[PDB]
Amino acid sequence: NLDIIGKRIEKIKQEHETSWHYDQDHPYKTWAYHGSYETKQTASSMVNGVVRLLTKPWDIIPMVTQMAMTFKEKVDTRTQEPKEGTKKLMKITAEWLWKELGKKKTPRMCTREEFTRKVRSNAALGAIFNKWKSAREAVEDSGFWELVDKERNLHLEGKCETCVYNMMSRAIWYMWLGARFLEFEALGFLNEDHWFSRENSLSGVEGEGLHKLGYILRDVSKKEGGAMYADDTAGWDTRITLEDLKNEEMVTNHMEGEHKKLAEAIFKLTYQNKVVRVQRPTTVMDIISRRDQRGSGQVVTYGLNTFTNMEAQLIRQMEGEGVFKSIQHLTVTEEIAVKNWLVRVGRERLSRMAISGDDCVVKPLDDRFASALTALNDMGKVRKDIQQWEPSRGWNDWTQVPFCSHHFHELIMKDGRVLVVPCRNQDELIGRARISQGAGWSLRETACLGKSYAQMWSLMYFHRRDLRLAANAICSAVPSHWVPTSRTTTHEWMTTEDMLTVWNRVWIQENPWMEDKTPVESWEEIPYLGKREDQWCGSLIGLTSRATWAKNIQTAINQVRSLIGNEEYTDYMPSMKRFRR
Numbered sequence: 001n002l003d004i005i006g007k008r009i010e011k012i013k014q015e016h017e018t019s020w021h022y023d024q025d026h027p028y029k030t031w032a033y034h035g036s037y038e039t040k041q042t043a044s045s046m047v048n049g050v051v052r053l054l055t056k057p058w059d060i061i062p063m064v065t066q067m068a069m070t071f072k073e074k075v076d077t078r079t080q081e082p083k084e085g086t087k088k089l090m091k092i093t094a095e096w097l098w099k100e101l102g103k104k105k106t107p108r109m110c111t112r113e114e115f116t117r118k119v120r121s122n123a124a125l126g127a128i129f130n131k132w133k134s135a136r137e138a139v140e141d142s143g144f145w146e147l148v149d150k151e152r153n154l155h156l157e158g159k160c161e162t163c164v165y166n167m168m169s170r171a172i173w174y175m176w177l178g179a180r181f182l183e184f185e186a187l188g189f190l191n192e193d194h195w196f197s198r199e200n201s202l203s204g205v206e207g208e209g210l211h212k213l214g215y216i217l218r219d220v221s222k223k224e225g226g227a228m229y230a231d232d233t234a235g236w237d238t239r240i241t242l243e244d245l246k247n248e249e250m251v252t253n254h255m256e257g258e259h260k261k262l263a264e265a266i267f268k269l270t271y272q273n274k275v276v277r278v279q280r281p282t283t284v285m286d287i288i289s290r291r292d293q294r295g296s297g298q299v300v301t302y303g304l305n306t307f308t309n310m311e312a313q314l315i316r317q318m319e320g321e322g323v324f325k326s327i328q329h330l331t332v333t334e335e336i337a338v339k340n341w342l343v344r345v346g347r348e349r350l351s352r353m354a355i356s357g358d359d360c361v362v363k364p365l366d367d368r369f370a371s372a373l374t375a376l377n378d379m380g381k382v383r384k385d386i387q388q389w390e391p392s393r394g395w396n397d398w399t400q401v402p403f404c405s406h407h408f409h410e411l412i413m414k415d416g417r418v419l420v421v422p423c424r425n426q427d428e429l430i431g432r433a434r435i436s437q438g439a440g441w442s443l444r445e446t447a448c449l450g451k452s453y454a455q456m457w458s459l460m461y462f463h464r465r466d467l468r469l470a471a472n473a474i475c476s477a478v479p480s481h482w483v484p485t486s487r488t489t490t491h492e493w494m495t496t497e498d499m500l501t502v503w504n505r506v507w508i509q510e511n512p513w514m515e516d517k518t519p520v521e522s523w524e525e526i527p528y529l530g531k532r533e534d535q536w537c538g539s540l541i542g543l544t545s546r547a548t549w550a551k552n553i554q555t556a557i558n559q560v561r562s563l564i565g566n567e568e569y570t571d572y573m574p575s576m577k578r579f580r581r
């Protein structure tokens, strides 16, 4: 408690000494409350006019139009302490998993140099505004790094002064850039060195690419065993226990020297004890604390969510296979059985999974897994939208499994080669492309963001009739040489290279599931879904609105060209059969 957080609390007390008050009508039950102080401020979703003008039929589709308009009673819940048998299973599994992940990887500190280059090309490193305007500025100024230095030496001393969370089924905890640097220095290696690559972690998919996920799920389907299970956790971040945080910290057991001490301090002072400032309208700032739940940088959050999910799913597999009988208590010989399972089959069982943070797909040895629920519930990883003790329903076909907000189709090219392609409901794809985040967008910047969506569609969703047409229209409407952009960033579509050349590189040349490397010479060689399958996944093909849009598309392209002005444009529409005369 207060010896670790008091210094952070004391320091904030004194910057708002005129405003401090121990409120008695505070709404916190599971958060420790400390005090309040005076503030007054709020970023809503803006429409991308380039994308909207080139997707007119969707202007009357509520599932698209409602996306652009407009639980914190889950952050304020409390998870129970797991039983001694559960805690044992987790500690044994966590110990074994960090050793496996560390066999081919060396923990190391990330550097000011590395941090600086990241900020100078717009990674979403959740920071705040004050003393300097942006992160881009603070980074070039040696004063900043003296602040960083002071805190750093405090962490080596085992104390914290300025690493405070700022709160904003989502919940994002920004810190000042200095705190983010110290987190990145100590734990950035997990992401920077790809500890959760599939080659390294066997279950992980970090860096693998949306064009690889479908092939990865099909490889899992090839294993002998039961149904494919894809259970979502209700509010994963809120169900991370102090025992989970202690198993995650064991990565420090693989470190040495300074790094070991800097990493241990991030875990102890910022993760296992948190200080948070929240805007309450009744508008004051609340300074609250708690020990458990996830509150870290988004990138460290991803890697530790992946780790703890891999751990939880191996234990659920152990329960299904009868490796232990009860979570109340492991016998001494059950401990040796669990250790022996891990050494004997652990790597095989990891390869039966695809795990992206809180999201998983598991193909267990058989369907006993479906009703193996005691360890999963006792760890606090309670399933979404199913009664606690009701057996999981699995998927019989890998093409129907949900993963990372997609499903995957098997699509045979006219030449017999096999593409496994990502897909989701087309209203969701069009609706997201019609939204921008933030202020002060020029027409040119808005156009370059539309071009980024269009090139993503050409590379990932070419098999959807409406998106290949709309992608060609947007790339025709935006000046040929203007560079695609984004404000929070594998994204092979972020290039001025010709999209057919990029398509060949991603789907043929670099695709390890494609034996025949014969390049495709035109977009007409590249297939679509069946027309009925395209409609099932939200296509407007067959509607009068869609027919008029497709037939008159050059009139829409010319409307956008007239707004942007007299620039160099390319006509990409004759890349499609129906516009090729």
Ligand SMILES: C[C@H]1CCC[C@@H](CO)N1S(C)(=O)=O
Pocket (backbone or CB within 6 Å): 104, 105, 106, 193, 194
């Ligand atoms: C362990 C080191 C060695 C150098 C390349 C690579 C191979 O796995 N890695 S790295 C940079 O990913 O940490």
Ligand SMILES: C[C@H]1CCC[C@@H](CO)N1S(C)(=O)=O
Pocket (backbone or CB within 6 Å): 205, 206, 207, 208, 209, 210, 213, 356, 404, 490
């Ligand atoms: C595998 C891809 C596709 C989308 C999910 C996400 C999580 O793993 N990734 S990635 C390359 O951005 O790391």
Ligand SMILES: [Zn+2]
Pocket (backbone or CB within 6 Å): 151, 155, 159, 160, 161, 162, 163, 269
């Ligand atoms: Zn600190």
Ligand SMILES: [Zn+2]
Pocket (backbone or CB within 6 Å): 407, 409, 423, 424, 537
């Ligand atoms: Zn689909």
